[PDB]
Amino acid sequence: MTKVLDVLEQFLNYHGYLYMRLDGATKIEDRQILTERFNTDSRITVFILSSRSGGLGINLTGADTVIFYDSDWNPAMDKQCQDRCHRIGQTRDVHIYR
């Protein structure tokens, strides 16, 4: 949902954790650099993504937990989205919170 993506930003501003998002909230020259920013370890803890744009066509390996919010038309896509968190750099199980 767009109205959730435009609301999570103020929550992040209030709670004051370093964050960045794989969504429609960056600039033209902050796409590959941000991809390597997630790929490289850092102090970040919040990465916001979409259901089918940044959650299927990427290779995120620096994540541990998955948070869903909703799924209208996805008979077998949410499992793939959960798997997208998983990678060979995940020595621990993929926690799920819903």
Next chain:
Amino acid sequence: KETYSSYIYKVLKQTHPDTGISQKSMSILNSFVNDIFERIATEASKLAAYNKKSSAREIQTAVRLIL
């Protein structure tokens, strides 16, 4: 829909039997042929109104002066 291309290739067979051309040349043919048609029609419009005689000689004068 309607294509001059078949008649154009008929004339080509009259000239060259087994030659291939490009589509961009066909589009330029369309543009230039049609603007020649517009200019030749425009030139020979009121010539019959130059004097009280209002044919073939109109378009003949058109091609005589444009060329």
Next chain:
Amino acid sequence: ELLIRKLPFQRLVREIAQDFKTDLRFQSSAIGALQESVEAYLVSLFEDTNLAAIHAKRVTIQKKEIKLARRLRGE
């Protein structure tokens, strides 16, 4: 009027145009308009070549000055 007198230009026009069609004739008009148009073109070319000479850092125009004046005026 006609700085080059009417009779010289008339003679030149008749001599040049006699070759196109036999027994060609003009009415009382079409006598002084040709020289006027020619001189208008000449004055336009003069203005253009004067501008070019102003650029050329020499008041004296030349062959190439008039060539540039004629070529870039439209034809």
Next chain:
Amino acid sequence: PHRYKPGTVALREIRRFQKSTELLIRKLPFQRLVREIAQDFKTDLRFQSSAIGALQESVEAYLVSLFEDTNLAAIHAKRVTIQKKEIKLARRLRGER
């Protein structure tokens, strides 16, 4: 450092750039200039697809013809390269207004 005389390597630049259908205008910002021109006064254009190429090639025709006329007026003077005064000569005689 094989640094040769400029003008002859500029000559090979001319030879490379004056041989094929290469688009010498690195010119999508030419398209943005066209957009600024078009939306300067009106809006809701709703034009064709490849019309940008045609208008840009007309721009190329005008500008390049200006370039050759300017170079001709420049060699007319004692300055081979493009000078603004030569461009004034090339444009004023065309009947700019």
Next chain:
Amino acid sequence: LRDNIQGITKPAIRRLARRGGVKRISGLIYEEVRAVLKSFLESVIRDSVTYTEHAKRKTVTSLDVVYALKRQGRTLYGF
């Protein structure tokens, strides 16, 4: 949602001069030809907006560019 120009190249303007028959350069080669571009385009669009504001009507298909530029003084073919 509008974008504007940044200077019209050292390189691409240089190739414009290259196909204009230029090898070296002066200090009056890059910028001014684009100024002539802007003046001519502003004149032709001035005529176009006069045409479309006198009667207050829109335009038609891509055949306009060839006719308008021919009246302007440099038109194009290609299609």
Next chain:
Amino acid sequence: ITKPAIRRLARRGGVKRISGLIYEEVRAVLKSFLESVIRDSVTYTEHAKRKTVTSLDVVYALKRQG
């Protein structure tokens, strides 16, 4: 045109310093432009169903090109 007419033209003639050059040049395209205009007039008057040049058939001679 002769020497005195060209002399007056050069008197206008950018402080007269351009005399010889215009003397040599301005006569080259005189006959060319005259031939062009008279040929255009002949072509315009070709379709007149008459036998002589009349102003009736040359009103729109250069309507194609202005």
Next chain:
Amino acid sequence: SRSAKAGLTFPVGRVHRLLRRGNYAQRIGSGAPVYLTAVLEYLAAEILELAGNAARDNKKTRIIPRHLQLAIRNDDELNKLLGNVTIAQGGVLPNIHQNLLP
């Protein structure tokens, strides 16, 4: 066909309707409404020969807009007809000045 009256082959029906209703002459009275198609056939044939010659050369078989631009700039009659036109998808005539050149 409806066009083979005098060696022509372009469509006639819609062309007959357009030339008869050209909205420029009151009536084409004996009368060459097909002369537009005649010059159309002439231009088509000349373009055919020129394009065949151009495509067959350059060790290819297709017409690049460069070749058509060269052909358009080549002719003199077309230059006299409408000399204020340019061809797209190509380049300008190559040029270098001996004064520009070292």
Next chain:
DNA sequence: GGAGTAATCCCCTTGGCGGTTAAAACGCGGGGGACAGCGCGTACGTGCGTTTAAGCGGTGCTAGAGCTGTCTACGACCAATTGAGCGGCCTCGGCACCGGGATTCTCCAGGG
């Protein structure tokens, strides 16, 4: 029994980003382009003693010109039939810029 209300399709935008290369610019070396003053002379400068022509005005009609009866010579409707190339497809010949191979384009520091 066709339309009034309104539940449906849906697709198209209003807008913001991945991926992205070109777009303009830097940047150093220098050497060719930048633009002109002088040399002097040649490149024009020029104004009054010396004539053909130009633009005409003295008759009489004098090559092309506008001229009104009453028309000769033709070019565009409709109605049942029908053929040209179009309505759609993609067939066999010949493609289409850097490689196998590198002599050209351009300058420079010693042979000379």
